[PDB]
């Protein structure tokens, strides 16, 4: 495939242009007031939004390049979110606001080395100062206070948050369900959560949440590589003849078998879905077999002889329910007996005792947590199926923004955050005076989500700004009701976390830019 | 798929031209006389109609965009019907009205967050004032009243309808079938209807009600999700060979299986469609039960470990006949005997002293009402089949305006009602002078269709116009007699809640289209 | 207008223009809000009218060598 | 308005917070700082202020009612 190459300032121009464009779509949707974009879908009614992560999710660009400069800025405002549980536009609008500015100097003959440098250090400096803008929240009271607001005013969220926080710990694995009658419920209950995610997107069958989510799934936990789709096929038949979907933890999934899994969910055949087993090694089968312990399934390894066909149901293990993401895999209600769950963690209990070494200690006792420590679960309860489903849906922002703030508490909302740490250091220097502009265009930059979103709700950038400015602390004007004051007392307030991992990740995306020298693509 | 991004005012011009398009041929066809728009048709002659909603379902404009616009007047302008039972072209010729002007003015440098205020107040207030102006329809002289109206003089449908609600109450469910004599008919039945709709609109077998309607089916009460046709094939069969429809009313039918229901009344190998079935969690059991005892069909539930694979004919529910819709299913006539059903009625009857909440309470007389309660059958009776099923199609007509009224009264029918509630307030006034331009824009948006009708007609608009604003009540013109007099006397009455959803509605598509600042699409 | 502004006082013809610009943006405006365009130059014209006396008012005579010089040097 | 733009900052900053002062109360471009204009010498002659007020208003009355425009082919 003969490639088309482009160099230093034709590559950036073109960046910015793509950059542009997603940024100009995406932006005007900022404030509590943003303005609609329509976007068209194939058969039937266009649709109308005010959702950036929508917009965004939408743009690509002809011009290969323009696009390669949209689809950057895109990747790394998703994982800001990713990150977060928000940003994912500011990110882009402050992502737009270096890009603009660093690029022009680039263009005016100063230094890229330098300008990035400059920016580097105005981020490194306002993360700072948002860590000393940031109000703690880590009592129920604070708990139950930033759900409340993240749900919108609804204060039975906010409780419900704060209660299962206060159950299973501000860590402790909290999921929702969809609710049964017309009052919410918390529960306790056996089960556990690790750090892996679906092999492939196409296992998703809720789109919404990107996410994977089997009811009352049998549990393959293999310990092997799975390559061959013949090694699972008298499971497979087990499994579809119980009408019911199938999980597999095995070590990984591979080719073959995996886009098999694949096209067999695609025309739903049988619903199933595959994650890597957590860790790595020697750690990985005694972690696998807690998974067993817990579902009262059979681990499947090969170091003891035996093959994934001689497994019939008997075999795998059993929950609830499992949802699965990017990155997460969360079981839910484990039918494995606690006379065997209690007994493991009484062997694991006693492992620790028997550790001579501390990262053979923590890694112990992550073992004894995930286990004993069970999975809080939220049923949403409402009156009609519509509230219910919208309920549900708050409680997963809330819980987000929840165990957000915890980590790192909350700051004013409007933009205020970003607009007042760069008024504090304002007398930032660097050595270049490219370096000062690199500080400048970084400071200058942080001002754009405020004045963003003032231009959206139709008043003027400058003013609001300027006035925001003058203040300390979280004072700040609050775009929806047109008032000026304290923007945490007002309940408009963003977890640290996502003001900062936004900031971070705009500035990442935007030195890299700014550093680019080369841009390759395929022919038009 | 790369995309052609549109901005501020190349977005709003695009969206104004596509709304047009679909406005200026959809808007001759107003009055009482309209002027015929020929639509082609691919093989054989054209077809001449002066019927708005058919014009409307034939709009599609090249340039997307354009198209967008006119898309998203039809798709908003059809909720109003869907919620009213007409306005579909008022809402339409309304929507213009403000996107136009409003439009014009954003243009002009003037501020569209206010603009939208302002038409959203006046539309605010005139909803009051339709609510004065409005007349109650609430005995049955009122109720037999609109029906003759509305079922175009004739005396005898008003009664038949008058009589339904009589027997049933103005709640209770009331269809229509063919008639079998020369005579009405008037029955009340054994059956139900419930608030959910087709789940593919391939099951469609009369395009013209946008319905389906099955004869003498069997329906399949399964208690679960399904999923796959393989469950399925033992009871599809003995279906088929019976020579019959049948419905499945389970907890979901999912992608396989539906897909293939849908490609297997396709072809018309066997006549089949499926529907969510009613309320959700504790409360659905429980209501599937009811339907079971209503049609004396065997639920299905998974929890008693029974498959479809073990279901013989025996074990479906059996009605003389079913409807769906979009979103209603009603089931008419069921089998079901009434040594089962009084006695369920006499169980649930006791569930009700054993209450001791009020949600507990109502949600159970829900269920004693549809079971107990029944459905009205009327029999269309006429002389020819021709002037059967058209005479069939107005009763329905009438049925529809009937029930609106009843909910929210009747008001002068000839755009009269909208010119009556404007020139009250017009002295409205908002904040912004902006404000002010949104409030009127509103205003004279709201004369749009009186005008349209007078001109249609081919008299003069501004004189017939201004002398209706001259009188009050419901004073106004009658387009098809050229005489001023009591609009509502004179037999040209709109249901208060259809002049009233047609102006939401188009208010609301206004709003978001003054508010548009990017347009997403795919490329030319 | 900053030809005119010129013949007159050889100076401010940027200010003038820079008003015009400015009457005329926001006139236009008004008149696409639907305003009789006759009546809105009645009003600027009598808004001016206004404020040439305001003008005639607020001025202060210029009559020491200091003064001079500052207008000299502002200029 | 421009005067202050021409500086690159905001003008409608600096235009509210002289609205809100009195008599001769403006602000010096030049040295970024409010005060009394009379008694910074930021002295404009009266003739001239008022001349380009009277003659903007003059033609911009005219042109803000133009309805039709001739005018030769391209
Ligand atoms: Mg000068």
Same sequence: chains 1, 2.
Avoid: W
Avoid at 211 to 222: K, N
Avoid at 508 to 517: D, K, R
Wanted: net charge negative.
């Amino acid at each position: 495939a003969a490639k088309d190459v482009k160099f230093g300032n034709d590559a950036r121009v073109k960046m910015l242009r793509g950059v542009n464009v997603l940024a100009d779509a995406v932006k005007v949707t900022l404030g509590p007031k943003g303005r609609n974009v329509v976007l068209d879908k194939s058969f039937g009614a266009p649709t109308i939004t005010k959702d950036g992560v929508s917009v965004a999710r939408e743009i690509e660009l002809e011009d290969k390049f323009e696009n390669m400069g949209a689809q950057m800025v895109k990747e790394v405002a998703s994982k800001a979110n990713d990150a977060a549980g928000d940003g994912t536009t500011t990110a882009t609008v402050l992502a737009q606001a270096i890009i603009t500015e660093g690029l022009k100097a680039v263009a005016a003959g100063m230094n890229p080395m330098d300008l990035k440098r400059g920016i580097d250090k105005a981020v490194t400096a306002a993360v700072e100062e948002l860590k000393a803008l940031s109000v703690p929240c880590s009592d129920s009271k604070a708990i139950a206070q930033v759900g409340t607001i993240s749900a919108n005013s609804d204060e039975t969220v906010g409780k419900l948050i704060a209660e299962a926080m206060d159950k299973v710990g501000k860590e402790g694995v909290i999921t929702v369900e969809d609710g049964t009658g017309l009052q919410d419920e918390l529960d306790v209950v056996e089960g556990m959560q690790f750090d892996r995610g679906y092999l492939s997107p196409y296992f998703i069958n809720k789109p919404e949440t990107g996410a994977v989510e089997l009811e009352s799934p049998f549990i393959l936990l293999a310990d092997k590589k799975i390559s061959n789709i013949r090694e699972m096929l008298p499971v497979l038949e087990a499994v579809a003849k119980a009408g019911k979907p199938l999980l597999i933890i095995a070590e990984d999934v591979e080719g073959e078998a995996l886009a098999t899994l694949v096209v067999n969910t695609m025309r739903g055949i049988v619903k199933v879905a595959a994650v890597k087993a957590p860790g790595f090694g020697d750690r990985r089968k005694a972690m696998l077999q807690d998974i067993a312990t817990l579902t009262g399934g059979t681990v499947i390894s090969e170091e003891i002889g035996m093959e994934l066909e001689k497994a019939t149901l008997e075999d795998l293990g059993q929950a609830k329910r499992v949802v699965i993401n990017k990155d997460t895999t969360t079981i839910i209600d484990g039918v494995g007996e606690e006379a065997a769950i209690q007994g493991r963690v009484a062997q694991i209990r006693q492992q620790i005792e028997e550790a001579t070494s501390d990262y053979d200690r923590e890694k112990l006792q992550e073992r004894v947590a995930k286990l004993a420590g069970g999975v809080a679960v939220i049923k949403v309860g409402a009156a009609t199926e519509v509230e219910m489903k919208e309920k549900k849906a708050r409680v997963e922002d809330a819980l987000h923004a929840t165990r957000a703030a915890v980590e790192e508490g909350v700051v004013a909302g409007g933009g205020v955050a970003l607009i007042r740490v760069a008024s504090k250091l304002a007398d930032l220097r660097g050595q270049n005076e490219d370096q000062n502009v690199g500080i400048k265009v970084a400071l200058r930059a942080m001002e754009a989500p405020l004045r963003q979103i003032v231009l959206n709700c139709g008043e003027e950038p400058s003013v609001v700004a300027n006035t925001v400015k003058g203040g300390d602390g979280n004072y700040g004007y609050n775009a929806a009701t047109e008032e000026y004051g304290n923007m945490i007392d007002m309940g408009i307030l963003d977890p640290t976390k996502v003001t900062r991992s936004a900031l971070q990740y705009a500035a990442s995306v935007a030195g890299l830019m700014i550093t680019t020298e080369c841009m390759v693509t395929d022919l038009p």
